Amino acid sequence: AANLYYKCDVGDSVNLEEVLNMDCDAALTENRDEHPRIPTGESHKSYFFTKRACRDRLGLACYLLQVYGYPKKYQFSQYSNMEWKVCSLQDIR
Numbered sequence: 719a720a721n722l723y724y725k726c727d728v729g730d731s732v733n734l735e736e737v738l739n740m741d742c743d744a745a746l747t748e749n750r751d752e753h754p755r756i757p758t759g760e761s762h763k764s765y766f767f768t769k770r771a772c773r774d775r776l777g778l779a780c781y782l783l784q785v786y787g788y789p790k791k792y793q794f795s796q797y798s799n800m801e802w803k804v805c806s807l808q809d810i811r
Contacts (some may be wrong), residue, residue: 720724721810726796727803729779735792740765740783753782754802762786762793764771782807 724732745765756762762784771779780797794805 721753723808723810724794724805725777725808726781726794726805728798729796730773731808732769732781732794732805736767737768737783737792738788740767740781741785745783752802753784754804756786756793758786758791760786765804 719734724734724735724737725781726732729784742765745767747764747766749762749764753764765785767781767783767784768778769781771777782802783795783799784795785791786793794807795802796805
């Protein structure tokens with residue numbers, strides 16, 4: 719869809735289509751106790767990506783896509799304060 723976006727604890731929005739690009743072999747990272755727990759308990763793969771937090775100021779920000787589930791569910795998170803906060807799906811309301 720295109721009516722949706724991720725609202726990340728700190729930084730600009732992240733739109734649906736960049737997260738999709740994270741779902742490839744190039745971004746595969748090992749899963750770690752640091753990462754946000756998978757909410758159902760299912761096995762998951764993890765994916766690491768970096769971009770400017772805000773395009774107005776300098777600063778790079780690390781983000782993480784976790785894929786789990788039989789019909790593929792996503793969980794998107796952002797590093798800030800040595801913490802992985804999960805970004806929250808929003809609608810352009």
